[PDB]
mmCIF file of C-alpha atoms and ligand atoms in Angstrom:
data_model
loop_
_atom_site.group_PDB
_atom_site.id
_atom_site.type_symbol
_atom_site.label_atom_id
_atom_site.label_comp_id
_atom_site.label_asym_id
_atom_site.label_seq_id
_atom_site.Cartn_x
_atom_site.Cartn_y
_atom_site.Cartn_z
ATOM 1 C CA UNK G 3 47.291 34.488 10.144
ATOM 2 C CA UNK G 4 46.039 32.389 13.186
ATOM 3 C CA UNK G 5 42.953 30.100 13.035
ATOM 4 C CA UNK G 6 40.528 28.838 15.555
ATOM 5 C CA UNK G 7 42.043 25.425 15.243
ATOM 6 C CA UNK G 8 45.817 26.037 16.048
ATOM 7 C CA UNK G 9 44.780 27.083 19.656
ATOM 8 C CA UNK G 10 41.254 25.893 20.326
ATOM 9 C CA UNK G 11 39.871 22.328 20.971
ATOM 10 C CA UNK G 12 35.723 21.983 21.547
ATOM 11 C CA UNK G 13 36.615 18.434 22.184
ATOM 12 C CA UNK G 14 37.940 18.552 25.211
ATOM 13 C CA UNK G 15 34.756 20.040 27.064
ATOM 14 C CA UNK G 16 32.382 17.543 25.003
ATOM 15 C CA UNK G 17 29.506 18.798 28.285
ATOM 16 C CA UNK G 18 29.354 21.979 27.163
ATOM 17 C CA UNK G 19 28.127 24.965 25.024
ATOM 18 C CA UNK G 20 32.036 25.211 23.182
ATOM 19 C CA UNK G 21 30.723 27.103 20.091
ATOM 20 C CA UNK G 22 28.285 29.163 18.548
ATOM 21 C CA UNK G 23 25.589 28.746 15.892
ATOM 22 C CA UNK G 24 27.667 32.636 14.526
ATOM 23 C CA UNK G 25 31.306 29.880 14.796
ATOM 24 C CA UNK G 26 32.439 32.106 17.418
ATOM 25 C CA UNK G 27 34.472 29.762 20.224
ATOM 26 C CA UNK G 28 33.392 29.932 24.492
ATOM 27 C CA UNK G 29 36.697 29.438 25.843
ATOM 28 C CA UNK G 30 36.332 26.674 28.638
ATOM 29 C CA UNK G 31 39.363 25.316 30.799
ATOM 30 C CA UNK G 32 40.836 22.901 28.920
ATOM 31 C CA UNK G 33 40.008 23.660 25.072
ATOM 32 C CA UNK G 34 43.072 26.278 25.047
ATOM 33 C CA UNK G 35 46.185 25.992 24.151
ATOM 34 C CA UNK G 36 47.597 29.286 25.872
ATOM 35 C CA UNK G 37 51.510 27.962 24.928
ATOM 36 C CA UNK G 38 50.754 28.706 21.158
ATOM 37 C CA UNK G 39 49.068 31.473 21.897
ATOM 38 C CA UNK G 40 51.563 33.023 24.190
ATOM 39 C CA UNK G 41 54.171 32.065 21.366
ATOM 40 C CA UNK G 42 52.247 33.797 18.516
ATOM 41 C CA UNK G 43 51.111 36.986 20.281
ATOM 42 C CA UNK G 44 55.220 37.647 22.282
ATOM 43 C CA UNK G 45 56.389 38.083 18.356
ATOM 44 C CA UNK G 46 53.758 40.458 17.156
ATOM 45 C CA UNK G 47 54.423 42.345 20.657
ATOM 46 C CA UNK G 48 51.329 42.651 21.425
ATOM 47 C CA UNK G 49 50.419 45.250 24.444
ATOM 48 C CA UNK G 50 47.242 44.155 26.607
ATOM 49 C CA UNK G 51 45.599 46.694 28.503
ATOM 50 C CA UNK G 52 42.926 47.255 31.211
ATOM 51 C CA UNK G 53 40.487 49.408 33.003
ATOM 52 C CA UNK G 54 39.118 49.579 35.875
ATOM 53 C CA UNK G 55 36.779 52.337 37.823
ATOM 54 C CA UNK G 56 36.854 52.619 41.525
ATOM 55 C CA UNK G 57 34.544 55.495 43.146
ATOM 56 C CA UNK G 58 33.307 55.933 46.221
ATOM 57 C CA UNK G 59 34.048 52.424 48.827
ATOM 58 C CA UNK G 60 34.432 51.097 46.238
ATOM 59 C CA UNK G 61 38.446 51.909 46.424
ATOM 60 C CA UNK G 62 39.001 51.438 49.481
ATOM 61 C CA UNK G 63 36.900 47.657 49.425
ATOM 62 C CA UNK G 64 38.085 46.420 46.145
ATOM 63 C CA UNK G 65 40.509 48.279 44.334
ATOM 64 C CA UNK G 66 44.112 47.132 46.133
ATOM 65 C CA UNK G 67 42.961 43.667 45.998
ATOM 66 C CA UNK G 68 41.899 43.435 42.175
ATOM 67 C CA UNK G 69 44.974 45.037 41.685
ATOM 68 C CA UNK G 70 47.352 43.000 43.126
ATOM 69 C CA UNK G 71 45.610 39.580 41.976
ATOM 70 C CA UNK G 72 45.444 41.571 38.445
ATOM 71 C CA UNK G 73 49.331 42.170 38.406
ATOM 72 C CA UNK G 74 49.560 38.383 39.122
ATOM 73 C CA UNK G 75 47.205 36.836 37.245
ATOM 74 C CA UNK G 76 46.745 39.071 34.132
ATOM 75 C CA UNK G 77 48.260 38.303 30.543
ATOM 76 C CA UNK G 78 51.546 37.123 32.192
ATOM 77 C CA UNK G 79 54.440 37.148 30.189
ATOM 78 C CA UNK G 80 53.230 40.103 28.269
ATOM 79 C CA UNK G 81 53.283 44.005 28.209
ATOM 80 C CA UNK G 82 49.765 45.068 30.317
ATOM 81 C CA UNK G 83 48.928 48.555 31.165
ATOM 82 C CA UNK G 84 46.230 49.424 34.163
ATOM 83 C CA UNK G 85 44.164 52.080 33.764
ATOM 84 C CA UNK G 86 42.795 53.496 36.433
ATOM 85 C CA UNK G 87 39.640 55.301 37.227
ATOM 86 C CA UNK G 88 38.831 56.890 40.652
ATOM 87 C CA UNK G 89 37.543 60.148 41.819
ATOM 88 C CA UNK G 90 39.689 60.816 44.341
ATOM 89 C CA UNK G 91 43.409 60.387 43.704
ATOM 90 C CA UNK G 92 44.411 60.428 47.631
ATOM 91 C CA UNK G 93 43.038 57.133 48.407
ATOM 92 C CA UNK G 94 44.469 55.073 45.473
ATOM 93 C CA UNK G 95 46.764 52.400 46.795
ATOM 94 C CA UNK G 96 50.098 52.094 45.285
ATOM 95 C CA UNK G 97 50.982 48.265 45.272
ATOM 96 C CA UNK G 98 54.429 47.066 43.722
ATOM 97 C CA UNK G 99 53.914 46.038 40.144
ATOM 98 C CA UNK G 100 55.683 43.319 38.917
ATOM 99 C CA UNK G 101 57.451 42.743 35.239
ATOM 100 C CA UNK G 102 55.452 43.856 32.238
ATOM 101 C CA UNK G 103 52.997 45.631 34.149
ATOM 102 C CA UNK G 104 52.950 49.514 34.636
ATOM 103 C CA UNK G 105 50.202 51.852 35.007
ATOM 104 C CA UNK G 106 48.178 55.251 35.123
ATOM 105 C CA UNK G 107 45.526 56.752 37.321
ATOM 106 C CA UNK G 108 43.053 59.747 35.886
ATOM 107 C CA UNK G 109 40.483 61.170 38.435
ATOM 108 C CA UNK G 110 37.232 61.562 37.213
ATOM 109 C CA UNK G 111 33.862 62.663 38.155
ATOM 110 C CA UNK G 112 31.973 60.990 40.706
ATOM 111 C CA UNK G 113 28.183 61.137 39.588
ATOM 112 C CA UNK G 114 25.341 61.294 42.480
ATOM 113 C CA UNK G 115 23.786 58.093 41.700
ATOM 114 C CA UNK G 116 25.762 54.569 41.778
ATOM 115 C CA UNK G 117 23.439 53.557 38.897
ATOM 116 C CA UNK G 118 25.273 56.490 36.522
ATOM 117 C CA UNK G 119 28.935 55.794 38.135
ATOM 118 C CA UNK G 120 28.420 52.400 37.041
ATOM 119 C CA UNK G 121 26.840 53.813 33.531
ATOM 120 C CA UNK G 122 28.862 56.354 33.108
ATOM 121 C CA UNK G 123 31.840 54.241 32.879
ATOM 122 C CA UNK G 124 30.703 53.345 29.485
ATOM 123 C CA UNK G 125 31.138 57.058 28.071
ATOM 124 C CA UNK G 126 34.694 57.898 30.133
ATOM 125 C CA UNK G 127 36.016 54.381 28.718
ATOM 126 C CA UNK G 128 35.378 55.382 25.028
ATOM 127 C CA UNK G 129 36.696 58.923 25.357
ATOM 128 C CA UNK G 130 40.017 57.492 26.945
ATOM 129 C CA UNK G 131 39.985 55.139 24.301
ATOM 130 C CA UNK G 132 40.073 57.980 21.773
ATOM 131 C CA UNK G 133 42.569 60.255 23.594
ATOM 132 C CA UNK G 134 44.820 57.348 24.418
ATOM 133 C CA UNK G 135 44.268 53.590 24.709
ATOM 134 C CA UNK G 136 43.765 53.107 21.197
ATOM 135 C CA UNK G 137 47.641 53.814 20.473
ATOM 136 C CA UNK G 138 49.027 51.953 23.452
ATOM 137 C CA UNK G 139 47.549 49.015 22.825
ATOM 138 C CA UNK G 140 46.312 46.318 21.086
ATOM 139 C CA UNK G 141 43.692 44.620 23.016
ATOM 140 C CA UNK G 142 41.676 45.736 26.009
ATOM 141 C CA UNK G 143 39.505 44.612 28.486
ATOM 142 C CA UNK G 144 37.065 46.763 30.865
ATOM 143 C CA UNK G 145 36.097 45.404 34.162
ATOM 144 C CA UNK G 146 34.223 45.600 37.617
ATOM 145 C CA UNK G 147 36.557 46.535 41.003
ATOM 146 C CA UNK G 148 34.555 43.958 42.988
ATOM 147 C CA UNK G 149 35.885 40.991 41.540
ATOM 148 C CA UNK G 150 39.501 39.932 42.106
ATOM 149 C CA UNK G 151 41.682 37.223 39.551
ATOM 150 C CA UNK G 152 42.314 33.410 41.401
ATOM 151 C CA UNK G 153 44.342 32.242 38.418
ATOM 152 C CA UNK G 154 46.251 32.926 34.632
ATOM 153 C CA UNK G 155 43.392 34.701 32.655
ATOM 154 C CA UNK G 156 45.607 35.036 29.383
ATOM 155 C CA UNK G 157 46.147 35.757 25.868
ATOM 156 C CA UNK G 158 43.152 33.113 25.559
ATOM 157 C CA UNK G 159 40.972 35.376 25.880
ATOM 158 C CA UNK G 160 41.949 37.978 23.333
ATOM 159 C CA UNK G 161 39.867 38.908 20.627
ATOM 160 C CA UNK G 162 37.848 41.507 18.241
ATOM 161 C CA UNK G 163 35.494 41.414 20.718
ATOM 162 C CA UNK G 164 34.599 39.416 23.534
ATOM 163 C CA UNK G 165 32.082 38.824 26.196
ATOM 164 C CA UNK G 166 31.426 37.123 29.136
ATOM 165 C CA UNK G 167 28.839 34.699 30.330
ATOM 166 C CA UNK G 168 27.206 36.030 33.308
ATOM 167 C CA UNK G 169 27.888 32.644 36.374
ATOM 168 C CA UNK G 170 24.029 32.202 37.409
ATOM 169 C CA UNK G 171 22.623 32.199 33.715
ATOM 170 C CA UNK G 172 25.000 30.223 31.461
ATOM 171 C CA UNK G 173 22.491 27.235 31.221
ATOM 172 C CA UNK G 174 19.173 28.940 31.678
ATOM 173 C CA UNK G 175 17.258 29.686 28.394
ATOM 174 C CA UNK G 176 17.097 33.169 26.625
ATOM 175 C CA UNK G 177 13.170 33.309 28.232
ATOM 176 C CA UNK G 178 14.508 33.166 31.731
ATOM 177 C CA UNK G 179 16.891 35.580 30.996
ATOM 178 C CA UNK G 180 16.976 39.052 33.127
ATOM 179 C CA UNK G 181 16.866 40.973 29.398
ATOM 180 C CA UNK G 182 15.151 44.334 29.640
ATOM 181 C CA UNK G 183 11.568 43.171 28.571
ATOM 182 C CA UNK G 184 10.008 46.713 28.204
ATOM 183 C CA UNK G 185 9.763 47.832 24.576
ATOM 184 C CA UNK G 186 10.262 51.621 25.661
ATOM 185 C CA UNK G 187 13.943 50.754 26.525
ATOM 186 C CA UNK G 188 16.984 50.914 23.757
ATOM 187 C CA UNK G 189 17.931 47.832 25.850
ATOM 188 C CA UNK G 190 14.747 45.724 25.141
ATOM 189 C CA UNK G 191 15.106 42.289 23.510
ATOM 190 C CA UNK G 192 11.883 40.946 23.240
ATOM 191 C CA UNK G 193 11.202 37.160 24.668
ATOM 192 C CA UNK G 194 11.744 34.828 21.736
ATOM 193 C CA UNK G 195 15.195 36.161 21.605
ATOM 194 C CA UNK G 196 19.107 36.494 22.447
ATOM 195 C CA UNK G 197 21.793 33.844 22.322
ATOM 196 C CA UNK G 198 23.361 34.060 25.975
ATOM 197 C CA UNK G 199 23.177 36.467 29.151
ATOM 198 C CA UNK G 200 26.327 38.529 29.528
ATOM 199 C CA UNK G 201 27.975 40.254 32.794
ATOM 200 C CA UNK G 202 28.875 43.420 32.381
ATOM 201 C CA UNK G 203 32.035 42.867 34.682
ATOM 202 C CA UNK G 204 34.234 41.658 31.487
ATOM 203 C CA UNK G 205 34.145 42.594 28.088
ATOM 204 C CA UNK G 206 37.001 43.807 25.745
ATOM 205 C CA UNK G 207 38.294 43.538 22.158
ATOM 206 C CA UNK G 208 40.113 45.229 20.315
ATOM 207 C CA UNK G 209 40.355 49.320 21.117
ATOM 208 C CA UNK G 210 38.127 49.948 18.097
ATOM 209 C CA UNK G 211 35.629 47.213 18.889
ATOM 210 C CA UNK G 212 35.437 48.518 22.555
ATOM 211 C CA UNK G 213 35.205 52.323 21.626
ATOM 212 C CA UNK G 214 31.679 51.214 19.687
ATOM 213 C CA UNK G 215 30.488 49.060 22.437
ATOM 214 C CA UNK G 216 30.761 51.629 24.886
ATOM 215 C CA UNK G 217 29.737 54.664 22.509
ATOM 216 C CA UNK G 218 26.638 52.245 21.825
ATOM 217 C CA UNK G 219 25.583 51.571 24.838
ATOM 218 C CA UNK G 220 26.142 54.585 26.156
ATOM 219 C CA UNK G 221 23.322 56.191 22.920
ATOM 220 C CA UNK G 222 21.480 53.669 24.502
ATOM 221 C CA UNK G 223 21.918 55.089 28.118
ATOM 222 C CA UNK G 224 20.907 58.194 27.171
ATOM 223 C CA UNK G 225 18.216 57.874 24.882
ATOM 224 C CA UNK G 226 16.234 56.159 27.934
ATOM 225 C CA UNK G 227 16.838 58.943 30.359
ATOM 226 C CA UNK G 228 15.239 61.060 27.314
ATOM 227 C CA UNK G 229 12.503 58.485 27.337
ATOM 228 C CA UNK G 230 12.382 58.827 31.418
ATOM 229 C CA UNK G 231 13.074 54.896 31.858
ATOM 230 C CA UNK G 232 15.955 53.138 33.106
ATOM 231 C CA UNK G 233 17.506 49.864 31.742
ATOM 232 C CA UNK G 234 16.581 47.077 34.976
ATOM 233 C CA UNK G 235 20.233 46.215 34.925
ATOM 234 C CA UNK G 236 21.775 49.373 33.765
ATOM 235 C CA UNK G 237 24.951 48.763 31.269
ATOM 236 C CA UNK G 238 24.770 45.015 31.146
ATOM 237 C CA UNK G 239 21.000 45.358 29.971
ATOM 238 C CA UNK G 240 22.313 47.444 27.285
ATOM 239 C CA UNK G 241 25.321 45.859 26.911
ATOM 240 C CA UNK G 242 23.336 42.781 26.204
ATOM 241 C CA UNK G 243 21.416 44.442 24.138
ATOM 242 C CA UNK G 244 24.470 45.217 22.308
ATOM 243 C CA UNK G 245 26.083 41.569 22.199
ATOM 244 C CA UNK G 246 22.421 40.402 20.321
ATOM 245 C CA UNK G 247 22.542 42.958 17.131
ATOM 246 C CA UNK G 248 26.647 42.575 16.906
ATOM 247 C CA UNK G 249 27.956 39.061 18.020
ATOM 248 C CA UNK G 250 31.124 38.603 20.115
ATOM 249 C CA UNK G 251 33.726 36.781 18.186
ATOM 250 C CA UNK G 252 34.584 35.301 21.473
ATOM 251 C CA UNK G 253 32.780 34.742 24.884
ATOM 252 C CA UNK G 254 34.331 33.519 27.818
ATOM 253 C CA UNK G 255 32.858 30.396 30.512
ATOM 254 C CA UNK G 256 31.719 31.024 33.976
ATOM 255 C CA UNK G 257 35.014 29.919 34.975
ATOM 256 C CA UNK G 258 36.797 33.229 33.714
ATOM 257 C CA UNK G 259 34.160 35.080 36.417
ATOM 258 C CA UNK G 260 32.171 32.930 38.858
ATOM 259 C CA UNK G 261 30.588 33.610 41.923
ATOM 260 C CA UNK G 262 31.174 30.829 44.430
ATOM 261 C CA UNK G 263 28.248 31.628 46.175
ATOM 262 C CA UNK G 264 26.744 29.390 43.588
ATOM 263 C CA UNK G 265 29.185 26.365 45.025
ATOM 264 C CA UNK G 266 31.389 24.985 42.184
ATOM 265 C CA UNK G 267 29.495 22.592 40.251
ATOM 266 C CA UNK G 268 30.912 19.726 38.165
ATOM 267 C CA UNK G 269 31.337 22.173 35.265
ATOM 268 C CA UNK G 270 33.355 25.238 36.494
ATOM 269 C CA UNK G 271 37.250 23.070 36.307
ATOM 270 C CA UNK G 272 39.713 26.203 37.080
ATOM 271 C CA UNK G 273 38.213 29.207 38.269
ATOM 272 C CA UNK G 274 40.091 32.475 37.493
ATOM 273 C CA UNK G 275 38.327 35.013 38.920
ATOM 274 C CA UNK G 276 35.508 35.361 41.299
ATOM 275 C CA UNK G 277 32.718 37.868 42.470
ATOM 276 C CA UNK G 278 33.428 39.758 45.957
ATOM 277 C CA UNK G 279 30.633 39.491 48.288
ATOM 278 C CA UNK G 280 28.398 42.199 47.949
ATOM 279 C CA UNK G 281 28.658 44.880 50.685
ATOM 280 C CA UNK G 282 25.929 47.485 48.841
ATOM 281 C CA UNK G 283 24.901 48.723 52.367
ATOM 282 C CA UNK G 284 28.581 50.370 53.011
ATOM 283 C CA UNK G 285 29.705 51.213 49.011
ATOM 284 C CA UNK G 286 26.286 52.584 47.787
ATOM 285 C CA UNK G 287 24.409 55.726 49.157
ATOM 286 C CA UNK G 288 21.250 55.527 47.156
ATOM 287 C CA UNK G 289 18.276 53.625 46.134
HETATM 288 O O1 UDP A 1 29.353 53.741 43.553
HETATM 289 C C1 UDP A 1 29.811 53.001 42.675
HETATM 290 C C2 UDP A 1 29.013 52.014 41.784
HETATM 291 C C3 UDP A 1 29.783 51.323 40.893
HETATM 292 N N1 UDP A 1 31.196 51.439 40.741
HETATM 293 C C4 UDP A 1 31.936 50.633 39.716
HETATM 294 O O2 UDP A 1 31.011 50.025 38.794
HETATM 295 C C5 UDP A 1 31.244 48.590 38.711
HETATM 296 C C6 UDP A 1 29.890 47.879 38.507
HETATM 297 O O3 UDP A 1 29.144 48.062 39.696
HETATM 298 P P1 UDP A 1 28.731 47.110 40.861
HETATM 299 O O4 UDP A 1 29.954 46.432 41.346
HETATM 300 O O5 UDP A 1 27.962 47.922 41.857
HETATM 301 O O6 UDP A 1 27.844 46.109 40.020
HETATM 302 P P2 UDP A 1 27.187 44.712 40.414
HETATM 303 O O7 UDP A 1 28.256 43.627 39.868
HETATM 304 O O8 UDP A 1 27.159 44.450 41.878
HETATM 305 O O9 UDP A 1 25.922 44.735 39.637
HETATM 306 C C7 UDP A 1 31.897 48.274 40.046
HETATM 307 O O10 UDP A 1 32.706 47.101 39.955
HETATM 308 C C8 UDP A 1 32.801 49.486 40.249
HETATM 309 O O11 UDP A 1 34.017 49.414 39.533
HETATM 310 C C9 UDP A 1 31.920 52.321 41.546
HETATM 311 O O12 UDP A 1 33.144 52.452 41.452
HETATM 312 N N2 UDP A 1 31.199 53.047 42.461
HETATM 313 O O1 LIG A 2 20.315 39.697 36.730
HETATM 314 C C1 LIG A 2 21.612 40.192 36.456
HETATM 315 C C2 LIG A 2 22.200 40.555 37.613
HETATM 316 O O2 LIG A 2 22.462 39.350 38.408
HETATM 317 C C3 LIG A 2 23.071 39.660 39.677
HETATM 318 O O3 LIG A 2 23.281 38.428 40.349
HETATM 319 C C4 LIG A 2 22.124 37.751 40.921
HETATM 320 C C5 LIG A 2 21.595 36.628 40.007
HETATM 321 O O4 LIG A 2 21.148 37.124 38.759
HETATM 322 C C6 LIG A 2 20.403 35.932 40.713
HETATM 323 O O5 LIG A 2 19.917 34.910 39.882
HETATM 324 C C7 LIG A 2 20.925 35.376 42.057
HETATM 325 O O6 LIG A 2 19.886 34.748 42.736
HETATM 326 O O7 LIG A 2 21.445 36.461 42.880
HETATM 327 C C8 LIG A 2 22.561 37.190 42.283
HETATM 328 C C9 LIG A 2 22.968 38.273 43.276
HETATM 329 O O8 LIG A 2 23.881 37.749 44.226
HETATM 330 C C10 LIG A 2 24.398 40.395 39.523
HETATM 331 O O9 LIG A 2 24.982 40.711 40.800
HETATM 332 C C11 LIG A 2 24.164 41.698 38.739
HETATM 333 O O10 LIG A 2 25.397 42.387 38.582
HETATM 334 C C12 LIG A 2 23.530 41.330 37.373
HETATM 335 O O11 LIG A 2 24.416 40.498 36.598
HETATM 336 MN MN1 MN A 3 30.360 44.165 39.938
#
């Protein structure tokens, strides 16, 4: 009972990409009108929720501070739960939550490799999705530990599903994309195609749209280790894979996850979250 135009106004970023040739909206600061939204979604009490994996450094680098910025800046004014994933229970820090936000912590199974931990996510997220998420709530989002929220990332950004564009690529073309270009690879996309690059550290939709993302890409994950090959950027190569046969109905700007290594150029107005430097020499132990 809600259309694109009671909340969403292309107009206002005139500069850039604001819709798809598919109609699906790229939700830039400024074309959103998070008051109706807010209004709209608090009556059909609505119940956001959101994981997050944490093995290895990882926890002890990242996970407190996406946490805290996630309490404060996360669907605000609305029921969130945090799930969280980390293999060793003991070093999990307990912040203070503040209203409308509780959570849960499973341990899981730390694989050898950081390539599979950071696969691997892609199976555990669909079985919890199965076993639980899918009756606590209504919309979910799965992201990376190493990033931490700067400002509101809202009810905006709720949808069937919904992807984001990756902050180095969002005005290259689909040729200078970092696809997988090998055509032994569930992940390939051959040059000549794909609408945008996505990051793999934010995607969601609903539970049901997220439980066949993941259970996709993760037949694509394991089909390749049957074909001895590896995707050249793991999950997001098959993620983006993904995103090109089954279209987002909604894909977030650079602004919802930018890397200010970049700078902040002209078109990134109100960033909301941003990439943590990477540290790979002290988090990873392999390759
Ligand atoms: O040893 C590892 C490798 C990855 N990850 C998780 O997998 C996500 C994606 O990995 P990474 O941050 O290494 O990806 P990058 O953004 O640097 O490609 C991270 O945010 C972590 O949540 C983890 O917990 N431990
Ligand atoms: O290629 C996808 C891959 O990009 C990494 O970021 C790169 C970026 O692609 C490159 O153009 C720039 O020069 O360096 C960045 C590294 O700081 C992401 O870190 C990785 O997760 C993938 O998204
Ligand atoms: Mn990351």
């Amino acid at each position: 009972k809600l259309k694109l135009s009671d909340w969403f106004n292309p107009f206002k970023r005139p500069e850039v990409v604001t819709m798809t040739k598919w109609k699906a909206p790229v939700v830039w600061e400024g074309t959103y009108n998070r008051a109706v939204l807010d209004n709209y979604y608090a009556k059909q009490k609505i119940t956001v929720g959101l994981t997050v994996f944490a093995v290895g450094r990882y926890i002890e680098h990242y996970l407190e501070e996406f946490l805290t910025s996630a309490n404060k800046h996360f669907m605000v004014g609305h029921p969130v739960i945090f799930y969280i994933m980390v293999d060793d229970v003991s070093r999990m820090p307990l912040i203070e939550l503040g209203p409308l936000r509780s959570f849960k912590v499973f341990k899981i199974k730390p694989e050898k490799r950081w390539q599979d931990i950071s696969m691997m996510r892609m199976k555990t997220i669909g079985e919890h999705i199965v076993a639980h998420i899918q009756h606590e709530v209504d919309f979910l989002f799965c992201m990376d530990v190493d990033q931490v929220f700067q400002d509101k990332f809202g009810v905006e950004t709720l949808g069937e599903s919904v992807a984001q564009l990756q902050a180095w690529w969002y005005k290259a073309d689909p040729n200078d994309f970092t696809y997988e270009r090998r055509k032994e690879s569930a992940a390939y996309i051959p040059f000549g195609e794909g609408d945008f690059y996505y990051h793999a550290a934010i995607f969601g939709g609903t539970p049901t749209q997220v439980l066949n993302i993941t259970q996709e890409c993760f037949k694509g994950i394991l089909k390749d280790k049957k074909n001895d090959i590896e995707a050249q950027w793991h999950d997001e190569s098959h993620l983006n894979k993904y995103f090109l046969l089954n279209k987002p109905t909604k894909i977030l700007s650079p602004e919802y996850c930018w890397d200010y290594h970049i700078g902040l150029p002209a078109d990134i107005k109100l960033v909301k979250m941003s990439w943590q430097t990477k540290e790979y020499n002290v988090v990873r132990n392999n390759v």
